Design a protein around this ligand. Structure first.
Ligand code: CLA
Ligand code: CLA
Ligand code: CLA
Ligand SMILES: CCCCCCCCCCCCCCCCCC(=O)OC[C@H](CO[C@@H]1O[C@H](CO)[C@H](O)[C@H](O)[C@H]1O)OC(=O)CCCCCCCCCCCCCCCCC
Ligand SMILES: CCCCCCCCCCCCCCCCCC(=O)OC[C@H](CO[C@@H]1O[C@H](CO)[C@H](O)[C@H](O)[C@H]1O)OC(=O)CCCCCCCCCCCCCCCCC
Ligand SMILES: CCCCCCCCCCCCCCCCCC(=O)OC[C@H](CO[C@@H]1O[C@H](CO)[C@H](O)[C@H](O)[C@H]1O)OC(=O)CCCCCCCCCCCCCCCCC
Ligand SMILES: CCCCCCCCCCCCCCCC(=O)OC[C@H](COP(=O)(O)OC[C@@H](O)CO)OC(=O)CCCCCCCCCCCCCCC
Ligand SMILES: CCCCCCCCCCCCCCCCCC(=O)OC[C@H](COP(=O)(O)O)OC(=O)CCCCCCCCCCCCCCCCC
Ligand SMILES: CCCCCCCCCCCCCCCCCC(=O)OC[C@H](COP(=O)(O)O)OC(=O)CCCCCCCCCCCCCCCCC
Ligand SMILES: CC1=C(/C=C/C(C)=C/C=C/C(C)=C/C=C/C=C(C)/C=C/C=C(C)/C=C/C2=C(C)CCCC2(C)C)C(C)(C)CCC1
Ligand SMILES: CC1=C(/C=C/C(C)=C/C=C/C(C)=C/C=C/C=C(C)/C=C/C=C(C)/C=C/C2=C(C)CCCC2(C)C)C(C)(C)CCC1
Ligand SMILES: CC1=C(/C=C/C(C)=C/C=C/C(C)=C/C=C/C=C(C)/C=C/C=C(C)/C=C/C2=C(C)CCCC2(C)C)C(C)(C)CCC1
Ligand code: OEX
Ligand SMILES: [Fe+2]
Lengths: 30, 342, 51, 60, 34, 336, 50, 48, 30, 37, 107, 38, 30, 37, 80, 30, 37, 30
């Protein structure tokens, strides 16, 4: 559970980064 | 480029901010793992069960006193794999047994190999000569002889240097007390090489910076240069005359100057490496037999060498009990050598 | 594993008297905390030694 | 006492002079060198092709 | 011993006076600048 | 045309046509250095034993008295004298002068004056030749180091006997006793000096290898490239752009030096600052301001002491402390 | 002329003289072996092998 | 063994870098320009 | 003191010195 | 048969002679002190 | 050999900083220019061979070229709504972090 | 949406203040707590 | 016996230094 | 002219592999300062 | 010139960059703080807490004597 | 047996040999 | 001043080298046997 | 010790003889 707390903390960071960078990343991929 | 090798070589040897190359596959993983192992060992892993000390920030040590410690002397020269017959796959007990030191050392040696290979590859890609790659042989020899050959000729990895500041200081003091390392001619050549290299660096920088040419109107002389220019930026004739009238001898060949600059520290480090290789088998230039015999027969003969011998004796006697817990040396206070009132 | 949290933001020191009590076979005394046990028996009848 | 010595160390004399002969030596040598310099300092100045006015010297 | 002291004093004052009166003899003007 | 005796003497002294420049600083430099050299050679070859600790225990340091080059030295002045001036004319006889350690003081004083005059003469020739006068500033770092080990440390410790002997084994003894008493290895200034020398060697090798790797082809394979360089030539003999490209692909582009002047200034500045700081550290430790003391710093919950590499170093220091002078101490504290 | 550290490069492209210099080296090594054996035999004491 | 490791390094470097044993080419600036070619040292990939 | 050090020192001083002198005299004559 | 086409002449200048002499004598100093014992 | 206009230093607002980055200074090429200490100029300028080699070292390898900067990045695409969402998220995360730090410690 | 950039000198000032504060915290923790000799 | 060897070595080194300083090959500007 | 650059490159991975653990370890070390013996 | 990547000066002065990285760096800092404070650091790497240096069994420093039974020996020495 | 005969023999062999070798190598080069 | 007009170059051929070597070695044989005593 | 010196002297003399015989400067008719 101690590692689960850190993973749950890290989840919204990944969500926010994906929300802010998905567009240009998809543009670069093509 | 159609073959697998050709396309892989096209991607690997690409023009990039960080050059990867074919040697990157060996350099980057091993170097990253060695750096990470050192940082993890200094931050979290302790040294209580293998040395009897505390060597981590978690236990209350600063940058100077934190280190990655060597295994216990019972382990001998075991390579101490994570899957070996000692740790047996347990990560926590592998860290407790001292397996991070061998991890760091074994990955660091291959990282050094990969770095020399990278130097060779980059030199060949740019079509120049591999003298920078040749110059790395001295650091590699020093690392090989100090961290591998010396422990391989001793009881075990326990007598290897530990990756830390105060640990290296203890290693140096141990080498003084037990081996009389200061009295080794090879170490004397190494010291001469290092100090001469520092002298050459300082003197060349000052001489070049103080014989410049007037290529601008500003007091800031760093802006009167262009790397693609043809003419030299300083007066070799003036430098040569100055150093001929001041010192007596001076350089008249830039190529010879810079080759000497390369040559001095490399030779010094190689000589020190040979000395440590010899010391690995306890083949130490420890004493002068004529001086010992004369001092024994005549109770009035004294030199600085005898005083150094007494100092080494004191160092050994007072450090032995804690530096080597495996010997289980219990020394009564009345057998330790001591001076008057001190 | 253990599960014990680190004593972060703890304002109390566990021991600060500088002494560690000792309970022996028919005697008791306060041993200084900075001292360590010893294995020397210099006098007859030694049952405890700290240095 | 068994022998003899100057016995002057750790005393605090002016310029270390315990005998007037040292003062005479210092003064004579200094005066000789000063006189030799004083005779020639006029000729030395003239090598700059300038007069020793209020604007003389190395200035910036 | 006093003779040695006198001789050394004479030598030292000779060399120091040479130094002083040489650096007083228009030294800044002895340069190749124009 | 010079006519006066003084004018001719000044012209000869400040002449740039001499094989070795004399100058006005050389007037002071030459006799002091010659005196120190003569006394050093004569004492190193045939000097009697010197009572260094003032406890009537003479120490031999001469070749004629059973020593080799590694063991021979010049024993510092007696501890009884202290910081007192001990010239040759303050002794009852030369036999007494040689027994107390006069030559050490003589050589030390003359050497200090000589090195100061040497730095001054470096400036002087730089001025006479039309150069920029900072090679003398570079020399100030070794000058300060020599002053610290020969003058300032005896000044702060109250005796010339705590000075560095003029020998090899004497130097090692000085280092060991210095470590036992001041913990020099833990001093940040000594760490900076070690970084200075190690970086100086690193950068000297790096620069030499990079320059040797970019030589332009002007010879054949049966002769050296040094024959490819001609003295007094105007064109540069190596490719700065090629060397910069190699280094910038070795680490990354903005880590190498594209400016030769800036690179050479960095080469000059690194070891000089390192040696300045290490000399300052020695001088500071002269007045008993030792290095970091992390002894019994890590303590567990019940108050017991957990040892560390610093504590192992402390054990070694205790070992080499109780033996640095066996019979020179009557009281428990070495306050000097 | 050639530097003192490049003298032996004359036999790089000469197979016959390469064989010659290798033969000279082998002769020197064999001579050392024989002479060392003789010298050790002249000073060995086989009286007590215990 | 240590001295012969150095010898191996030296002789391998000399045999691979044999054409530049006397020195580098007189004009070697276009190939050592940062970001001039896609591939390092390849003149057939001039872009970026 | 090893009395065999005198011959070793003499040989080490002389043989390389003679080699260097041969080379230099030949070069200076040429 | 025909003269060897791989003929070269060695050389050594005064600077190299001085460097070699200095190296020989310094090594002699150090290791003679250590060998006399 | 070097074209100063193609070195990507044309998008700098400050004229003095722009001249500094190219290694150029119009003041110093004047024959009557005098620096702070009082030394006359010989007309060389910042670099003597500026015409022969095109430019200086500063104009050869600049480390600040606004021309090569991406056209995007000077404006945030997500606009004000993105900034409001970021403010809400950072406030929430700061509160959660301080609560976790306080709870896991010994008060 | 939001035109404009952040000053590089402002970025450098904030980063320097942050690292200085970190080093100060490290020194304070060296003077109290674990490894403080008391 | 060894003192003579030490003194000879030191004197030879000093003589080599003197000869290197005062009998050098003079640089010539091309 | 218009300049378009990729977001994820080799330099991105090289920077982040050294930046992320550095910040994690710095946070851990900062937490370590307030532990009482 | 440039090897084909966005300049560091361009990236470091971007609202997008400082909006993304106003979360990641503090998140990593808090993650490290929680890793230390929750006792995970002691358990993962086996470091002794201040109260676990000496047990009631032995009051001296640990010593490992067997190479092949080292795992069991260090398990016994670490017993609380 | 005089142990000082070894050094005398070595010097007498080597020094004239080196002198002759210097002369001959110079002549052959010339 | 002007170069010395008394400049001469020494020489020694292989026959002289062989004769000198033979003389040196024969004298060494005889007088070494007599000096070792 | 002296036997080695005697044998070395004799062997050196024989080697000099061999080299003089088989590596002589060949006479040339003018
Ligand atoms: C990039 C190269 C690289 C290299 C050279 C090394 C080198 C080393 N590692 Mg490191 N390591 C790396 C990357 C690398 N590592 C990576 C990416 C990780 C993941 C984090 C690790 C994690 C790691 C751990 C956990 C440990 C090491 C340790 C060691 C040693 C391993 C000893 C061993 O027996 O190897 C294996 C032996 C070999 C000879 C392998 C080569 C066999 C060839 C390829 C034949 C293939 C044939 C086979 C039958 C068929 C397979 C093909 C099929 C399955 C597809 C060695 C010094 C050990 C250590 O340092 O102990 C102190 C150890 O504990 N490494
Ligand atoms: C220390 C670094 C080092 C360096 C920089 C070089 C450099 C070079 N080598 Mg040398 N070499 C070395 C050490 C080194 N060598 C060692 C230790 C050996 C074994 C005797 C050799 C044997 C060797 C041969 C036989 C040849 C060269 C040649 C060369 C040249 C280029 C070819 C090369 O890259 O080989 C590759 C060199 C490597 C060291 C990289 C391989 C990395 C190994 C395989 C790591 C794998 C990890 C390991 C399996 C993990 C588990 C082990 C664990 C259980 C302990 C170049 C001069 C070649 C040449 O061109 O000569 C003219 C050639 O013919 N080398
Ligand atoms: C396996 C044998 C071996 C062989 C055949 C070669 C062959 C060669 N070497 Mg290499 N070399 C080797 C090992 C070897 N090397 C080792 C181990 C090292 C590291 C020390 C080097 C380092 C090296 C360098 C640095 C150079 C060469 C060069 C050369 C070439 C010319 C050498 C020269 O003329 O010397 C002539 C030598 C002398 C006039 C006197 C040297 C005397 C030495 C200092 C000590 C006396 C030696 C003693 C009597 C015998 C040694 C005992 C034995 C156990 C080694 C030649 C192709 C040269 C080159 O590349 O040319 C282009 C060159 O510059 N080599
Ligand atoms: C030049 C470039 C070099 C690059 C190096 C790159 C990494 C190299 C990877 C291998 C390194 C590890 C080698 C371990 C050897 C080892 O454990 O030896 C130690 C063990 C022997 O083990 C010992 O045995 C003794 C017997 O009485 C005792 O029991 C000891 O307690 C025991 O430790 O030997 C071996 O494993 C193999 C020995 C033979 C091979 C020698 C290899 C090199 C040795 C160097 C010289 C030593 C003196
Ligand atoms: C002050 C004028 C300066 C003019 C310009 C001088 C330029 C430099 C010239 C060379 C100087 C160095 C060499 C000097 C050698 C002769 C001196 C000597 O050996 O004396 C050595 C002698 C020792 O005298 C001893 O005395 C004993 C009794 O006390 C016994 O009699 C001994 O026999 C006797 O030898 O000391 C003196 O002469 C005292 C000198 C006092 C000088 C005071 C100067 C005051 C004004 C300056 C103040 C600042 C000075 C610097 C301080 C900071 C330094 C870091
Ligand atoms: C030298 C070249 C650089 C080598 C790497 C340096 C960084 C390594 C990690 C250091 C670290 O995290 O320390 C972290 C440690 C943590 O601090 C420790 O924390 C413990 C917690 O239980 C205790 O409280 C200790 O008392 C306390 O000192 O900080 C220090 O040691 C203080 C020094 C701060 C950083 C110094 C960096 C090195 C010196 C400067 C080098 C460059 C000079 C220009
Ligand atoms: C009043 C003066 C005050 C200071 C006096 C200084 C005296 C010392 C001068 C030493 C010169 C010796 C140079 C030899 C070799 C020589 O001839 O040098 C001359 C050499 C010539 O260089 P070139 O450019 O002409 O060489 C061209 C190439 O083709 C060479 O192959 O220049 C140097 O290498 C300078 C480095 C000297 C480094 C010497 C450091 C000191 C040596 C160690 C001393 C030991 C003492 C032991 C005592 C027991
Ligand atoms: C402990 C002392 C015991 C007594 C002495 C033992 C023997 C010591 C060495 C004796 C020979 C010394 C050199 C002889 C040749 C000198 C030639 C010369 O200078 O001008 C002629 C020579 C005449 O040519 P010219 O001027 O063109 O007519 O002048 C030159 O400039 C020739 C070029 C070579 C210069 C010297 C080369 C190196 C010589 C050896 C250096 C090391 C010496 C070590 C010993 C020093 C003394 C202790
Ligand atoms: C007992 C101990 C044995 C081991 C120690 C041996 C010590 C001596 C080492 C040197 C041995 C001989 C080296 C010869 C060097 C020149 C090479 C050569 O001859 O090339 C042929 C050479 C071939 O070269 P080419 O002319 O270019 O074809 O033929 C010549 O004519 C070259 C001119 C020189 C001829 C020889 C001159 C005199 C050499 C010294 C004679 C005495 C040597 C020592 C004898 C006793 C040995 C124990
Ligand atoms: C062990 C191991 C591993 C690995 C890991 C890793 C890879 C890690 C990493 C890690 C890391 C990668 C870490 C890092 C860290 C860092 C840090 C901790 C830093 C710090 C810093 C500082 C403290 C700084 C300071 C300063 C300042 C502030 C000022 C100026 C100077 C200087 C810069 C010094 C694995 C799992 C694979 C496997 C098993 C084993
Ligand atoms: C002709 C002939 C013959 C004869 C032969 C002979 C008799 C031979 C001999 C040979 C010999 C008898 C040889 C020898 C050799 C030797 C050698 C080759 C040696 C070497 C050495 C070395 C090289 C050393 C070194 C070193 C040193 C010095 C010191 C320490 C270090 C070292 C080890 C490095 C007969 C009749 C049989 C047959 C027919 C032909
Ligand atoms: C940008 C930059 C940087 C920097 C950094 C830093 C970290 C800085 C800081 C800065 C600062 C941080 C500053 C400050 C200042 C302050 C001041 C100047 C203050 C003043 C005050 C006063 C004057 C006061 C007064 C008073 C009194 C006395 C009484 C009461 C009232 C009052 C409070 C008012 C670096 C190096 C990274 C790099 C380059 C760039
Ligand atoms: O004299 Mn030389 O070292 Ca100056 O501390 Mn006290 O005194 Mn003695 O002991 Mn430690
Ligand atoms: Fe340079």
């Amino acid at each position: 559970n101690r590692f689960g707390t850190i993973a749950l903390l890290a989840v919204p960071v990944i969500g926010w980064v994906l929300f802010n960078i998905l567009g240009p990343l998809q543009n670069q991929l093509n | 480029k159609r073959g697998w090798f050709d396309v892989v070589d096209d991607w690997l040897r690409r023009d990039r901010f960080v050059f990867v190359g074919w040697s990157g596959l060996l350099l980057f993983p091993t170097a990253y793992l060695a750096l990470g192992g050192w940082f993890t060992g200094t931050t979290f892993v302790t040294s209580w069960y293998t040395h009897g000390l505390a060597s981590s920030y978690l236990e209350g040590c600063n940058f100077l006193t934190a280190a990655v410690s060597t295994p216990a002397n019972s382990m001998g020269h075991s390579l101490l794999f994570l899957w070996g017959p000692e740790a047996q796959g347990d990560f926590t007990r592998w860290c407790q047994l001292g397996g991070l030191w061998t991890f760091v050392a074994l990955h660091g040696s291959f990282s050094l190999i990969g770095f020399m290979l990278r130097q060779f590859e980059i030199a060949r890609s740019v079509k120049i000569r591999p003298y920078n790659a040749i110059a790395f042989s001295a650091p590699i020899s020093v690392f090989v002889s100090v961290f591998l050959i010396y422990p391989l000729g001793q009881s075990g990895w326990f007598f290897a240097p530990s990756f830390g500041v105060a640990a290296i200081f203890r290693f140096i003091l141990f080498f003084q007390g037990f081996h009389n390392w200061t009295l080794n001619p090879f170490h004397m050549m190494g010291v001469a090489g290092v100090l001469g290299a520092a002298l050459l660096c300082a003197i060349h920088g000052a001489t070049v910076e103080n014989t410049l040419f007037e290529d601008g109107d500003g007091a800031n002389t760093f802006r009167a240069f262009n790397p693609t220019q043809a003419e030299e930026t300083y007066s070799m004739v003036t430098a040569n005359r100055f150093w001929s009238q001041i010192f007596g001898v001076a350089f008249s060949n830039k190529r010879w100057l810079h080759f000497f600059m390369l040559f001095v520290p490399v030779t010094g480090l190689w000589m020190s490496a040979i000395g440590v290789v010899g010391l690995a088998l306890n083949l130490r230039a420890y004493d002068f037999v004529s001086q010992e015999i004369r001092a024994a027969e005549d109770p009035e003969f004294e030199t600085f060498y005898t005083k150094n011998i007494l100092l080494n004796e004191g160092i050994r006697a007072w450090m032995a009990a804690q530096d080597q817990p495996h010997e289980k040396l219990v020394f009564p206070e009345e057998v330790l050598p001591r001076g008057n009132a001190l | 594993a253990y599960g014990d949290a680190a004593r972060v933001f703890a304002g109390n020191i566990t021991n600060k008297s500088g002494f560690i009590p000792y309970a022996g076979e028919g005697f008791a005394l306060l041993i200084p905390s900075k001292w360590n046990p010893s294995k020397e028996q210099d006098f007859p009848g030694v049952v405890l030694r700290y240095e | 006492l068994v022998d003899d010595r100057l016995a002057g160390e750790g005393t605090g004399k002016i310029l270390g002079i315990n005998d007037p002969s040292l003062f005479w030596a210092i003064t004579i040598v200094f005066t000789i060198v000063w006189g030799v310099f004083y005779v020639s300092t006029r000729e030395i100045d003239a090598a700059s092709d300038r007069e020793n006015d209020d604007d003389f010297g190395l200035t910036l | 011993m006093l003779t040695l002291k006198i001789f050394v004093y004479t030598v030292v004052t000779f060399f120091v006076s040479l130094f002083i009166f040489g650096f007083l003899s228009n030294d800044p003007g002895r340069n190749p600048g124009q | 045309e010079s006519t006066s005796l003084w004018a001719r003497f000044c012209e000869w002294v400040t002449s740039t046509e001499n094989r070795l420049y004399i100058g006005w600083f050389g007037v002071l430099m030459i006799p002091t250095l010659l005196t120190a050299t003569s006394v050093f050679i004569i004492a190193f070859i045939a000097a009697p034993p010197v009572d260094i600790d003032g406890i009537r225990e003479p120490v031999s340091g001469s070749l004629l008295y059973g020593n080799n080059i590694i063991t021979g030295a010049i024993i510092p002045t007696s501890n009884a004298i202290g910081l007192h001036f001990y010239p040759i004319w303050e002794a009852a006889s030369l036999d007494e002068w040689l027994y107390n350690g006069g030559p050490y003081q003589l050589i030390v004083c003359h050497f200090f004056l000589g090195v100061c005059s040497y730095m001054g003469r470096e400036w002087e020739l730089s001025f006479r030749l039309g150069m920029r006068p900072w090679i003398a500033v570079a020399y100030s770092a070794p000058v300060a180091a020599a002053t610290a080990v020969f003058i300032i440390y005896p000044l702060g410790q109250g005796s010339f006997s705590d000075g560095m002997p003029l020998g090899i084994s004497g130097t090692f003894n000085f280092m060991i006793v210095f470590q036992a008493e001041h913990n020099i290895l833990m001093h940040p200034f000594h760490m900076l000096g070690v970084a200075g020398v190690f970086g100086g060697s690193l950068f000297s090798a790096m620069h030499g290898s990079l320059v040797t790797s970019s030589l332009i082809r002007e010879t054949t394979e049966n002769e050296s490239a040094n024959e490819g360089y001609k003295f007094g030539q105007e064109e540069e003999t190596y490719n700065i752009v090629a060397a910069h490209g190699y280094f910038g692909r070795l680490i990354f582009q903005y880590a190498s030096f594209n400016n030769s002047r800036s690179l050479h200034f960095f080469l000059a500045a690194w070891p000089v600052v390192g040696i300045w700081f290490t000399a300052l550290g020695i001088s500071t430790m002269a007045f008993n301001l030792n290095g970091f003391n992390f002894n019994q710093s890590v303590v567990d919950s019940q108050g017991r002491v957990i040892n560390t590499w610093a504590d192992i170093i402390n054990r070694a220091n205790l070992g080499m402390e109780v033996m640095h002078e066996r019979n020179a101490h009557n009281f428990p504290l070495d306050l000097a | 002329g050639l530097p003192w550290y490049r003298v032996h490069t004359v036999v790089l492209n000469d197979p016959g003289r390469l064989i010659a210099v290798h033969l000279m080296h082998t002769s020197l090594v064999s001579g050392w072996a024989g002479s060392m054996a003789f010298y050790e035999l002249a000073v060995f004491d086989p009286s007590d092998p215990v | 063994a240590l001295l012969f490791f150095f010898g191996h390094i030296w002789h391998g470097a000399r045999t691979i870098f044999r054409d530049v044993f006397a020195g580098i080419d007189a004009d070697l600036d276009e190939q050592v320009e940062f970001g001039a070619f896609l591939k390092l040292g390849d003149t057939s990939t001039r872009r970026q | 003191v090893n009395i065999l050090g005198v011959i070793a020192t003499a040989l080490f001083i002389i043989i390389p010195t003679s080699f260097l002198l041969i080379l230099y005299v030949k070069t200076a004559s040429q | 048969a025909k003269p060897n086409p791989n003929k070269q002449s060695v050389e050594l200048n005064r600077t190299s002679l001085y460097w070699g002499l200095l190296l020989i004598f310094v090594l002699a100093v150090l290791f003679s002190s250590y060998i006399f014992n | 050999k070097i074209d100063i206009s193609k070195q990507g230093l044309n998008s700098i607002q400050n004229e003095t900083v722009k001249l500094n980055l190219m290694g150029k200074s119009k003041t110093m090429e004047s024959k009557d220019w005098v620096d702070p200490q009082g030394r006359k100029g010989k007309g060389y300028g910042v670099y003597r061979f500026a015409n022969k080699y095109g430019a200086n070292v500063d104009g050869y390898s600049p480390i600040y070229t606004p021309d090569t900067w991406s056209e995007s990045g000077d404006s945030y695409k997500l606009g004000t709504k993105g900034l409001i969402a970021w403010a809400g998220l950072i406030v929430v995360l700061l509160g959660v972090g301080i609560n976790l730090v306080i709870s896991t410690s010994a008060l | 949406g939001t035109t404009g950039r952040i000053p590089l000198w402002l970025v450098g000032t904030v980063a320097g203040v942050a690292v200085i504060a970190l080093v100060g915290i490290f020194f304070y923790g060296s003077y109290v707590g674990l490894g403080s000799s008391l | 016996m060894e003192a003579l060897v030490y003194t000879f070595l030191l004197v030879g080194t000093l003589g080599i230094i003197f000869f290197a300083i005062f009998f050098r090959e003079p640089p010539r500007i091309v | 002219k218009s300049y378009t650059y990729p977001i994820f490159t080799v330099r991105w991975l090289a920077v982040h592999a050294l930046a992320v653990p550095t910040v994690f370890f710095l946070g851990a070390i900062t937490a370590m300062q307030f532990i009482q013996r | 010139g440039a090897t084909g990547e966005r300049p560091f000066s361009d990236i470091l002065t971007s609202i997008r960059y400082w909006v993304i990285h106003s979360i990641t760096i503090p998140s990593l800092f808090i993650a490290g703080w929680l890793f230390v404070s929750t006792g995970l650091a002691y358990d993962v790497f086996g470091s002794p807490r201040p109260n676990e240096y000496f047990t009631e069994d032995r009051q001296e420093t640990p010593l490992i004597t067997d190479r092949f039974n080292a795992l069991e020996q260090v398990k016994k020495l670490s017993e609380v």
